[PDB]
Amino acid sequence: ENAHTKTVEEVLGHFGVNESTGLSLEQVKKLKERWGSNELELVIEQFEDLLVRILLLAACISFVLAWFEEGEETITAFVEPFVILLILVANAIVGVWQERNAENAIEALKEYEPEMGKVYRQDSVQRIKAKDIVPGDIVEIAVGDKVPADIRLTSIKSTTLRVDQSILTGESVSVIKHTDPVPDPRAVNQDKKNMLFSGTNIAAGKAMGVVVATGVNTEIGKIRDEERTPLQQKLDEFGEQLSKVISLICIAVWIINIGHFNDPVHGGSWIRGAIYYFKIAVALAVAAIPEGLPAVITTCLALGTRRMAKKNAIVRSLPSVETLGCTSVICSDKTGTLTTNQMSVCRMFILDKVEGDTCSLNEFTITGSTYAPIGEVHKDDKPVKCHQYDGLVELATICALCNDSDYNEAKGVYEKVGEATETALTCLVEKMNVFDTELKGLSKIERANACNSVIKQLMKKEFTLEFSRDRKSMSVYCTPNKPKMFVKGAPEGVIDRCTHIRVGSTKVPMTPGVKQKIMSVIREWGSGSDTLRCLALATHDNPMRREEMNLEDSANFIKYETNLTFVGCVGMLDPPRIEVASSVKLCRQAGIRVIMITGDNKGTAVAICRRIGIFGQDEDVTSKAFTGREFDELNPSAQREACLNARCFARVEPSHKSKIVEFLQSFDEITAMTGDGVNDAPALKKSEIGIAMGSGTAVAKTASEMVLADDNFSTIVAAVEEGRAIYNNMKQFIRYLISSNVGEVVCIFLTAALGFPEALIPVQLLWVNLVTDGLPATALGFNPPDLDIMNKPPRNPKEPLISGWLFFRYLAIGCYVGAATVGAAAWWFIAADGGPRVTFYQLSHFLQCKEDNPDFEGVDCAVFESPYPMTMALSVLVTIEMCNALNSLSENQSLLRMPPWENIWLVGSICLSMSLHFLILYVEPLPLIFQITPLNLTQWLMVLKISLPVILMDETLKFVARNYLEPA
Ligand SMILES: Nc1ncnc2c1ncn2[C@@H]1O[C@H](COP(=O)(O)OP(=O)(O)CP(=O)(O)O)[C@@H](O)[C@H]1O
Ligand SMILES: [Ca+2]
Ligand SMILES: [Ca+2]
Ligand SMILES: [Ca+2]
Ligand SMILES: [K+]
């Protein structure tokens, strides 16, 4: 169906629905059975990055050398392409495997928190899943809700209705809707002002309509078909900078070896020698270039996102992970975010006697802490019947009629309809029973709305003035049923607008001494151990005429609140979440300065920061907290200075929340806002990272880079930890390959400078890449979090990636790894059991091999080109670089406190590589391409003896790191 133009009567008759009741269970069934619910090569390809493009060229030019039918050896040339291609597809499959597991955790998280919608059906308004909405349902949504499906407006409960069409049309400015018909069918969607389209957000107003499209038939579903954190741009620069350094050395090695082209090992020709050293340069390039750098990125990000899904935290922005790591300060909302978001009225007071500055007191306490309509009114450990007091009856009238706020039969609990703060005013009226009406004969769903239904019948609701966050009050005007204005709002804001007080039923003007009697108790409830929210309850006994008043401007409603009469004030208890006290404590240990940006009273906010940990109980607050009205009354010199020191902000308007973030960003402070309502939407947008609770508004979820299905605030601390756990893993990844592959460069330069036969065959240089730089390097993405991961200071994006001291340890480790594999091959010539005994100053020039060269006779003939030194160099090179992989588990922590088995993915990786190293040397057909199996008894005891002290070379510098930890 495409019924859009015609009036509301014909579209309701098309579906055969009633606006009051709605569809039934069997009518939704058929409609659900007719339209339905309401809702590989590129995957494998990780090869798009620049570094992968190099080995693909190196694998092709190596494939061309094998096409010449010689390759210096018919079987050896065939191995060079496979060694290069195996490491590329291996790192690709592992990275896709983690993206495979990452997509499996996101889909399971979608089932954990399905989108919700507010509907009217035959079985009060109820909320169900968004996919169960069928065409014909009656849907009523308010400010902050996301439009679930295409809806034809049938009624508007406000003076205006604004809808944000930024997702569908691209218009950032909201447009005003209406229930009037439109003339033309095929007009553009921007001219359709009587339709609510899915995906759009409600900017202002509260409307109710009928659904005309679901699932695929949705208007936004028609078009829906068809870089990360400059660190990666820096990594793309790092990959480009490191490649040019390697490219400069490889072309230099080919020039250094220009004099060795004519050696007899190559065949006695410059062409025969240039090709062999051209393969040396290519084998050195492929070995030195990091292969799994694009793979460790996907590995760490797919590991982190899958760890966040385990803790039930949605990540809507992929790059927003490591931005959390560099977060300097975090500022979060209080209500719903730092509290358990459970409102219930526990205390209440009115005025008893007033004379001059002397005023008396009375305190009414409410038992029970739930949303259930059961409780007892008590005063001084004694029950109180609230029928005698006319002030409590008028107080109950304010709590009931100025509010628009259902028993769950499945779980057997009462759930709130609307906001939680207003819901506590509803259950408060039910507990009073001011008119002494019998409540036992009614059912549970009838008991929860029993006392409010009686007041609704006694006093008719004429019209309502919407709540605004700037004037901090909600005004309603009532009239007895057969043909009074009373307002509730902020205590410090309404009492100033109250010029009268009603002692019992007698109204007398406001006394400045009695005004302070009320505020002192409000502060004691706010700053006490209870930390209660207070709501001033007033009534305007000189109500203005209806049409004499204007409802177009919400800011003009302050004139309508002049000459109020104070009735009373109620207290509400919303305990903080049991994990928030530890969250700020770990944020203090991580250098993150926690800020509380809320709109409630400062007396309530400063008492929280003392309980939670933002402020110490022994700490005093001199200039570390300000109200919104005090924040604007500070000189510009102290205006910015307060943003750096103050860890709490109260009574701020939604326009001031976005500014506080802007003042922090001016000092280059990385911020993170956590909010639940549309109040925080300008702040969530403006901030670097936005956080919205799972029970928060959908507008806050859209602007937030994270959504917490489990609204526990402890996830924020673990979220910053994971962004800091991907950073150090990328450090250990670069820490491993650089410090190891520099020794590969030191190896080749040392053999030429010392005067020994060159270290390894180009195939022997490509093999160590497949073993040392492959799956052992990718397994570093699975490293466990470091011991000091949440105590070390945060990251500054202005500073370079590699520190000055870290560049030193890259060389210090590279000097030993390079000299160990050369000294191993040197050991075979100097003193070897199975080898010759030829020292005589290492016979620095080995080029003299025949015949019985004078003054170097030699015990035997020329034994160069023998595999025993070459394999000795590779046996240690593979072994010493596996011992270096154990050093990359932590940054500065000793290995006796970070055991090697903390990373299970690496231990099994080294055993697979060492077995692959052993499978290669010991299986008879393989040592033709490779050269010769070494000795088992004596050599491996020497390989282990040489490859072991590299662990000592690393832990002694961690001792220096444990002595003092500075970048340098
Ligand atoms: N619906 C309502 N009617 C009357 N007064 C309200 C009200 N909602 C809040 N107030 C009061 O107005 C003052 C302003 O509160 P505001 O709504 O601007 O921030 P908040 O802290 O309540 C939202 P958050 O959950 O994000 O912390 C509060 O002190 C509150 O007591
Ligand atoms: Ca490599
Ligand atoms: Ca909130
Ligand atoms: Ca290597
Ligand atoms: K943002």
Coordinates of N, CA and C and ligand atoms in Angstrom, one line a residue, residues 333-337 469 598 675-677 679-680, ligand 3:
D333 N 28.0 12.4 32.3 CA 26.8 12.8 32.9 C 26.6 11.9 34.2
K334 N 25.7 12.5 35.1 CA 25.5 11.8 36.3 C 24.2 10.9 36.3
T335 N 23.1 11.5 36.1 CA 21.8 10.7 36.2 C 21.7 9.7 35.0
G336 N 21.5 8.4 35.4 CA 21.3 7.4 34.4 C 22.7 6.8 34.0
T337 N 23.7 7.6 34.0 CA 25.0 7.2 33.7 C 25.8 6.7 34.9
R469 N 14.8 22.7 29.7 CA 16.0 22.5 30.5 C 16.7 23.8 30.8
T598 N 26.9 17.9 34.7 CA 25.5 17.6 34.9 C 24.7 18.9 35.1
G675 N 26.9 10.3 27.9 CA 25.6 10.9 28.2 C 24.5 9.9 27.7
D676 N 23.3 10.2 28.2 CA 22.2 9.3 27.9 C 21.0 10.0 27.2
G677 N 20.9 11.4 27.2 CA 19.8 12.1 26.7 C 20.2 13.0 25.6
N679 N 20.1 16.1 25.8 CA 20.9 17.2 26.4 C 22.4 17.1 26.1
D680 N 22.9 15.8 26.1 CA 24.3 15.6 25.8 C 24.7 15.4 24.4
Ligands
CA3 CA 21.4 11.5 32.1

